[PDB]
């Protein structure tokens, strides 16, 4: 039963907007916006050979704060009717430096 978290729960502040992976070649921006309730906006990438739909986008929010709420709303749903998957747009770097012990 214990539970309980305490601000973002990560070594560095959140980010605004969310990354969502795991869309529908279909589902549009539009249905990815409302996903989130609380948003203002939303994106989504598209392939520039194809150029459809790639399957991902972002949801771009007025403050951390309400992307976070909104994070964990949709944490287990799906968008037309697939499961995706919301990380804070956050980059990595040239492969693996940052985060260490010694």
């Given at each position: 039963?214990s539970s309980?978290?305490?601000?973002?729960?990560?070594?560095?502040?959140?980010?605004?907007?969310?990354?969502?992976?795991?869309?529908?070649?279909?589902?549009?921006?539009?249905?990815?916006?409302?996903?989130?309730?609380?948003?203002?906006?939303?994106?989504?990438?598209?392939?520039?050979?194809?150029?459809?739909?790639?399957?991902?986008?972002?949801?771009?929010?007025?403050?951390?704060?309400?992307?976070?709420?909104?994070?964990?709303?949709?944490?287990?749903?799906?968008?037309?009717?697939?499961?995706?998957?919301?990380?804070?747009?956050?980059?990595?770097?040239?492969?693996?430096?940052?985060?260490?012990?010694?």
């Open positions: 039963g309980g978290s305490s601000g973002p729960n990560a070594r560095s502040q959140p980010s605004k907007t969310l990354f969502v992976k795991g869309l529908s070649e279909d589902t549009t921006e539009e249905t990815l916006k409302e996903s989130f309730d609380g948003s203002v906006r939303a994106r989504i990438v598209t392939d520039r050979e194809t150029g459809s739909s790639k399957g991902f986008g972002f949801v771009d929010f007025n403050s951390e704060e309400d992307a976070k709420a909104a994070k964990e709303a949709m944490e287990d749903g799906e968008i037309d009717g697939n499961k995706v998957t919301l990380d804070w747009a956050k980059p990595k770097g040239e492969g693996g430096s940052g985060p260490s012990s010694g």
